[PDB]
Amino acid sequence: AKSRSSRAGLQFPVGRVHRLLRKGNYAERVGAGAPVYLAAVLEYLTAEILELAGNAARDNKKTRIIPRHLQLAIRNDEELNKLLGRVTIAQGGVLPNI
Amino acid sequence: KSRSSRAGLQFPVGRVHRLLRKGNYAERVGAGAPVYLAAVLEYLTAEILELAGNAARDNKKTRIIPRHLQLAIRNDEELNKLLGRVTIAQGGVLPNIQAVLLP
Amino acid sequence: GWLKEIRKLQKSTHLLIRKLPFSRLAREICVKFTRGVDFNWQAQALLALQEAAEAFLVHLFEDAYLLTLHAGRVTLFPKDVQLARRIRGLEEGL
Amino acid sequence: SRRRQGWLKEIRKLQKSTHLLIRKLPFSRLAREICVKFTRGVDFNWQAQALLALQEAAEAFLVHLFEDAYLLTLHAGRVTLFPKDVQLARRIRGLEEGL
Amino acid sequence: STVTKSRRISRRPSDWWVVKS
Amino acid sequence: RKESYSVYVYKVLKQVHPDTGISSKAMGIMNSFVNDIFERIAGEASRLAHYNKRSTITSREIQTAVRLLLPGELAKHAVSEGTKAVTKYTSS
Amino acid sequence: RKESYSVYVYKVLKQVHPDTGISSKAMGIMNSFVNDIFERIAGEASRLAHYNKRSTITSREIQTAVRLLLPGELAKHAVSEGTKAVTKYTSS
Amino acid sequence: LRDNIQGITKPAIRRLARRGGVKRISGLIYEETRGVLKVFLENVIRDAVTYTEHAKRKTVTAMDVVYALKRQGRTLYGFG
Amino acid sequence: DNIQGITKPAIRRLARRGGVKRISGLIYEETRGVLKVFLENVIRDAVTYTEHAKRKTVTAMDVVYALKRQGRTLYGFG
DNA sequence: CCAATTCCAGATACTACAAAAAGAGTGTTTCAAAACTGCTCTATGAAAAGGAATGTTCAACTCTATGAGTTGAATGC
DNA sequence: CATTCAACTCATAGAGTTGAACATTCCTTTTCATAGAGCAGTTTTGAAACACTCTTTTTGTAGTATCTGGAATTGG
């Protein structure tokens, strides 16, 4: 009668993350606040990437995001480039470097 | 009547079985998986110990020290590729000097 | 001439190697490993393999040209690629 | 003639031993200073084995980095090491192995 | 360059960064 | 029947950009990113719980794993977001 | 009250070299090596079992993980030893 | 040409080098590039075929390639 | 000035064990900075591991785990 | 080179629906707080010797401009 | 695939820079005792937190019908 993701004031699903934690054989028990914490972190990272992707798309007179915009947004950020250091984006290209 | 003796091994089978059961790997464990794992572990240990003993004997010694383990590991391409990101304490380096520097 | 070519290629995002030669080479290498049996291939698998290979090659060329500029030249040599593979350390350069 | 090549015998002797090269007290002082700079105001204790392991790891890292930097130096056509060699070695090793 | 108890040839890591024909 | 994170990504996109769309390959890339980060954090929390002889995974393990895995400012803001979310969820 | 592999390593050493001893640091290094290899193989077998939607770890998963992890000749000889031990164990 | 390794032509290698930022290339680069690509493909294809024949299938799937690349330390996001 | 405790002869010994023949004067400060960055990263990870548990003493296993989490394995202190 | 027109592939919008997750209750288990014991980290003292620090010097190292020999990017078919 | 010539690489020598080698000294690290006590390790237990089960609703998840951003071509 009331979603847990709305209880936490989020958009990502909480019950799905809880089930995926329970069925991933990570430990024999799972707490109650761990899925909320994980969903909040995931939503924050998603929004952080999507904002820069939308900015990169707007700076090219486009109204739809393509993998090139995601590549630009990820490689033009310091901490995001540090986090995704061993990841390859398909159809993303490279950054213009002389 | 031991399982290790039944499989003709020196490494323990019950201990590996218990470690697999209490390691958070899967809900069920078979019967030949611990035997297979113990056999592989014993084979690797025997290879390393033989190479280290040969190194110590050629070095005119009687006891194996970490230096001999380093010399044995770094002189075998497959063992070197397996332990590529491992550091051995008090092991030192191999005596490698560039030929351009030496006259 | 070369400058416009580099500036245009660094802006596009399409694959640079043809599909049929890559498919033939991958199929022969795959049949070399098995016991003579012929395996089927999906199109997405070959596409992913080509994407990964091309990304790897472009990054290796970037590193090799860094080494070339350090050596005091402007032309790329095979020893630059070899030294880049050696410095990458047995897991990334191979 | 004072000494033709003492560096040769020095390297040959150093590549055969397996003992630590940095003193223990300055290393401990530096490690404690960094650790107290990380924590807010608390002063943490340190086991001896922890400091020994840290020193071993640091010295191994430095020796390997020096090997790679001298490879780059020899590629550049020189016999003297420069800081640019260390910088380029870190850059080519990447974000993790190059810090 | 060395044959252990089992007949596995233990070779020295000569070279791996050069392309061989 | 398959499962993905498309609806939630579209929701947060409409939240951050009201007049911008997205392709299908970009959505697949976002799904892969979410799955990768999930796996990383969950594995780190599991091994953390194993090190200290515990049989439960709590928000403390998640916070420690986030502090260990993300760089500085990202980790600070993610810790703040998670703490705020848990505090809002508890008072209900 | 601690566990190690000292007695088994000593038995293997006596089988290989009957007139050779070993220090304590080398024994600690050997214990570390055994634990590392165990962890690697078990994790790879778990991942393999999860990919194909199975809830059991059998000798086939161990064999495939050994083939995936070790280089060529080491993998061949390890598979030989493993199947030999299995067929000797099931015939009793 | 007739050999399958010769199907990777000089224009394609030149385009890859130009995308990488290279300005001037030598003649001996193409064979080295072919050899490096061959080693890369051999490793990835061996791992993928192992993953494929672990299951009782005869068709190579994109997920096998993704798993091989991931276990070798190279994550791919597009074909997940 | 604890960073100055790492003297010039010690850096010389490290470079000689690494195989270096000649060293320039500007290298000691660079080496000090690199060592400082390495120590900062490892000590941050180890202190996080230590304070996750309710302890106030850094142990060897904390350092081992901190090194392992960065792609470096140590065998002697297991 | 940029601007305008038109076309169509590829988006968005729109519904049935079935299965997954809250609601509620019941049984299990586990981890923090308290008391006790021990243990090794730290701060101190007395010698001492050898290794770091200063200073000087000179043969060894690098930088740079230049001529001789090689080649690969552009072009047409 | 055939030419080519302007754009490269390579070897050499002179001007300037500098790091290894060495005498001396004294200061700083190392070694042999020495507790004090702050902090870590061991044992109980119980109240709160987590797992297990049946029901019903609601939400993602495919299928179906419309709408439009983006690519191409031609002309100025």
Q: Tell the residue number behind the tokens 């050069």, with chain if given.
A: E18
- Is residue I70 classed exposed, middle or buried when 0-12, 13-18 and 19+ CB atoms within 10 A define those classes? middle
DSSP H/E element including D9: helix D6-14
Buried b (16+ CB within 10 A) or exposed e, D68-93: bbbbbbbbbeeeebbbebbebbbebb
Overall residue count recorded for chain F in this entry? 92
User: Which tokens hold the place of C59?
Assistant: 């990054």
Q: Kindly report the CA angle at F83 between F82 and F84, in degrees rounded to 5? A: 90
Residue pair C17/C54 in contact (Cβ under 8 Å)? The answer is yes
Residue pair H37/C57 in contact (Cβ under 8 Å)? The answer is yes
Residue pair F25/F32 in contact (Cβ under 8 Å)? The answer is no
A29 touches strand K (CB under 7 A): yes
User: For residues G84 and G29, what is the distance between their CA atoms, to the nearest angstrom?
Assistant: 28
| Interchain CB distance below 8 Å, C48 and A92 | no
Strands H59-60 and C75-76: unpaired
| Interchain CB distance below 8 Å, G73 and E9 | yes
| Interchain CB distance below 8 Å, C52 and A88 | yes
Q: Which of H32, A20, F36, B95 is nearest to D16 (CA)?
A: B95
CA closest to C1' of J63 belongs to D78
Buried b (16+ CB within 10 A) or exposed e, H3-21: ebbebbeeebbbbbbbbbb
- The backbone torsions φ and ψ at residue I13, rounded to the nearest 5 degrees and listed phi first, read -65, -40
- Interface test mutation site (partner H, options A68, A74, A80, A88, max chain H beta carbons within 10 A): A88
Overall residue count recorded for chain D in this entry? 99
Q: Which of F69, I44, H72 is nearest to A84 (CA)?
A: F69
| Interchain CB distance below 8 Å, E18 and C90 | no
For CA atoms B81, B86, B89, B90, the dihedral sign is positive
The answer to whether residue G74 neighbours chain E at the CB level (below 8 Å) is yes
What is the rounded radius of gyration, in angstroms, for the C-alpha atoms of chain D?
Answer: 18
User: For residues B8 and F58, what is the distance between their CA atoms, to the nearest angstrom?
Assistant: 44
N- to C-terminal Cα distance for chain H?
35
User: For residues C2 and D64, what is the distance between their CA atoms, to the nearest angstrom?
Assistant: 39
- Is residue G52 classed exposed, middle or buried when 0-12, 13-18 and 19+ CB atoms within 10 A define those classes? exposed
**Long-range pairs of F9-18 with CB within 8 A, sequence gap ≥ 24:** F9/A46, F9/A50, F9/F34, F11/A11, F12/A11, F12/A43, F12/A46, F12/A47, F12/A50, F13/A50, F13/A54, F15/A11, F15/A47, F16/A47, F16/A50, F16/A51, F16/A54, F17/A50, F17/A51, F17/A54
CA distance I74 to chain B (A): 5
- Is residue A62 classed exposed, middle or buried when 0-12, 13-18 and 19+ CB atoms within 10 A define those classes? middle
DSSP states of I15-63: HHHTT--EE-TTHHHHHHHHHHHHHHHHHHHHHHHHHHTT-SEE-HHHH
Cβ count within 10 A of residue I73: 18
**Angle between helix H29-54 and helix H62-71 axes, rounded to 10 deg:** 110
Residue pair A28/F55 in contact (Cβ under 8 Å)? The answer is yes
Cβ-based contacts (< 7 Å) between D 32-61 and strand K:
45
DSSP states of C37-90: PPPEE-HHHHHHHHHHHHHHHHHHHHHHHHHHHHHT-SEE-HHHHHHHHHHHTS
One-letter amino acid identity for A40? A
User: Which tokens hold the place of F47?
Assistant: 């091994």
User: For residues D83 and D62, what is the distance between their CA atoms, to the nearest angstrom?
Assistant: 14
CA distance C50 to chain E (A): 21
Buried b (16+ CB within 10 A) or exposed e, B31-52: ebbbbbbbbbbbbbbbbbbbbb
Question: Given its phi and psi angles, is residue F67 left (phi above 0), alpha (psi -120 to 50 degrees) or beta?
Answer: alpha
Q: Which of A23, G49, A71 is nearest to F33 (CA)?
A: A71
Cβ neighbours of residue G14 closer than 8 Å, sequence gap 6 or more: none
Considering all nucleic acid strands, name the nucleotide whose C1' atom is nearest to the C-alpha of residue D29. K29
D2 touches strand K (CB under 7 A): yes
Which residues partner with E9 through β-bridges?
E3
Report how far Cα C76 is from the mean position of its chain's Cα atoms: 15
Cβ neighbours of residue F68 closer than 8 Å, sequence gap 6 or more: F44, I45, I48, I69
Experimental method: cryo-EM
User: For residues B36 and I43, what is the distance between their CA atoms, to the nearest angstrom?
Assistant: 40
Going by beta carbons, is chain B in contact with chain I, meaning 3 or more pairs sit under 8 Å apart? yes
User: For residues A35 and F89, what is the distance between their CA atoms, to the nearest angstrom?
Assistant: 11
Name chain E contacts of B80, Cβ cutoff 8 Å: 13
Residue G57 CB-half CA count within 13 A = 26
Q: Write out chain B in H/E/C secondary structure.
A: CCHHHHCCCCCCCHHHHHHHHCCCCCCEECCCHHHHHHHHHHHHHHHHHHHHHHHHHHCCCCEECHHHHHHHHHCCHHHHHHCCCEECCCCCCCCCCCCCCCC
Structural domains in chain G, CATH included, are 1-92 (1.10.20.10)
CA distance A13 to chain H (A): 21
The residues spanned by each domain of chain D are 19-94
User: Which tokens hold the place of A76?
Assistant: 């033009």
Q: Which of C78, C61, C12 is nearest to H21 (CA)?
A: C61
Which residues partner with G37 through β-bridges?
none
User: For residues H59 and C43, what is the distance between their CA atoms, to the nearest angstrom?
Assistant: 11
3-state secondary structure of E21: coil
Residue pair A88/C55 in contact (Cβ under 8 Å)? The answer is yes
CA closest to C1' of J42 belongs to D45
Alpha helices in E1-21 (DSSP H): none
* CA distances, C45 to each of B81, B84, C51, F71 (Å): 28, 30, 10, 34
Cβ count within 10 A of residue C28: 12
The answer to whether residue B75 neighbours chain E at the CB level (below 8 Å) is yes
3-state secondary structure of A64: strand
- Is residue G6 classed exposed, middle or buried when 0-12, 13-18 and 19+ CB atoms within 10 A define those classes? middle
CATH class of domain segment(s) C14-89: mainly alpha
3-state secondary structure of D81: strand
* CA distances, D83 to each of D74, G71, I25, I30 (Å): 14, 37, 10, 7
Q: Which of B88, B79, B85 is nearest to B43 (CA)?
A: B79
DSSP states of chain G: ----SHHHHHHHHHHH-TT-EE-HHHHHHHHHHHHHHHHHHHHHHHHHHHHTT-SEE-HHHHHHHHHHHS-HHHHHHHHHHHHHHHHHHTT-
3-state secondary structure of F16: helix
The answer to whether residue C91 neighbours chain B at the CB level (below 8 Å) is yes
One-letter amino acid identity for H7? G
Q: Which of I26, H13, D85 is nearest to C66 (CA)?
A: D85
User: For residues A84 and I29, what is the distance between their CA atoms, to the nearest angstrom?
Assistant: 31
For CA atoms D48, D52, D55, D61, the dihedral sign is negative
**Angle between helix C43-71 and helix H62-71 axes, rounded to 10 deg:** 30
User: Which tokens hold the place of I36?
Assistant: 């400082």
**Long-range pairs of B16-20 with CB within 8 A, sequence gap ≥ 24:** B16/B41, B16/G38, B19/G38, B20/G42, B20/G57
User: For residues F70 and F76, what is the distance between their CA atoms, to the nearest angstrom?
Assistant: 9
**Angle between helix F59-69 and helix A34-58 axes, rounded to 10 deg:** 40
Residue pair G73/E9 in contact (Cβ under 8 Å)? The answer is yes
Question: Given its phi and psi angles, is residue C38 left (phi above 0), alpha (psi -120 to 50 degrees) or beta?
Answer: beta
Q: Which superfamily does D19-94 belong to?
A: Histone, subunit A (1.10.20.10)
Q: Which of G59, F54, D37 is nearest to B34 (CA)?
A: G59
The answer to whether residue D96 neighbours chain A at the CB level (below 8 Å) is yes
Q: Which of D6, D8, D50 is nearest to D28 (CA)?
A: D50
3-state secondary structure of D98: coil
* CA distances, F80 to each of A37, A60, D56, F34, I19 (Å): 10, 33, 37, 20, 48
Name chain C contacts of B85, Cβ cutoff 8 Å: 91
User: Which tokens hold the place of I75?
Assistant: 């065998």
* CA distances, I6 to each of D17, D20, I32 (Å): 20, 13, 8
User: Which tokens hold the place of D75?
Assistant: 């590629």
User: For residues H33 and C16, what is the distance between their CA atoms, to the nearest angstrom?
Assistant: 14
The answer to whether residue C60 neighbours chain E at the CB level (below 8 Å) is no
Q: Tell the residue number behind the tokens 């080479």, with chain if given.
A: C25
Q: Which of D71, B94, D67 is nearest to I19 (CA)?
A: D67
| Interchain CB distance below 8 Å, C11 and A91 | no
The answer to whether residue B88 neighbours chain A at the CB level (below 8 Å) is no
Considering all nucleic acid strands, name the nucleotide whose C1' atom is nearest to the C-alpha of residue A3. J22
| Interchain CB distance below 8 Å, B93 and D56 | no
Overall residue count recorded for chain C in this entry? 94
Going by beta carbons, is chain E in contact with chain F, meaning 3 or more pairs sit under 8 Å apart? no
Q: Which of B54, B92, B96 is nearest to B70 (CA)?
A: B92
The residues spanned by each domain of chain B are 1-98
Residue pair B63/B56 in contact (Cβ under 8 Å)? The answer is yes
Structural domains in chain I, CATH included, are 1-78 (1.10.20.10)
Considering all nucleic acid strands, name the nucleotide whose C1' atom is nearest to the C-alpha of residue F23. J11
DSSP H/E element including D70: helix D48-75
One-letter amino acid identity for I69? R
Cβ neighbours of residue B41 closer than 8 Å, sequence gap 6 or more: B11, B16, G34, G37, G38
What is the rounded radius of gyration, in angstroms, for the C-alpha atoms of chain A?
Answer: 17
For CA atoms H46, H52, H58, H61, the dihedral sign is negative
Q: Measured between CB atoms, which of B3, B35, B88 is closest to G86?
A: B35
DSSP states of H18-76: HHTT--EE-TTHHHHHHHHHHHHHHHHHHHHHHHHHHTT-SEE-HHHHHHHHHHTT-EE
DSSP states of F33-78: HHHHHHHHHHHHHHHHHHHTT-SEE-HHHHHHHHHHHS-HHHHHHH
Stated resolution in angstroms: 12.0
| Interchain CB distance below 8 Å, B80 and E13 | yes
User: For residues B92 and D47, what is the distance between their CA atoms, to the nearest angstrom?
Assistant: 24
| Interchain CB distance below 8 Å, A90 and C7 | no
User: For residues I78 and I76, what is the distance between their CA atoms, to the nearest angstrom?
Assistant: 6
Q: Which of B79, F69, D95, I36 is nearest to C88 (CA)?
A: D95
> Which residue of chain B is at minimal alpha-carbon distance from C91?
B84
Q: Which superfamily does A1-98 belong to?
A: Histone, subunit A (1.10.20.10)
Å between I21 CA and K18 C1'?
A: 15
Cβ neighbours of residue H8 closer than 8 Å, sequence gap 6 or more: C17, C21, C22, C25, H33, H34, H37
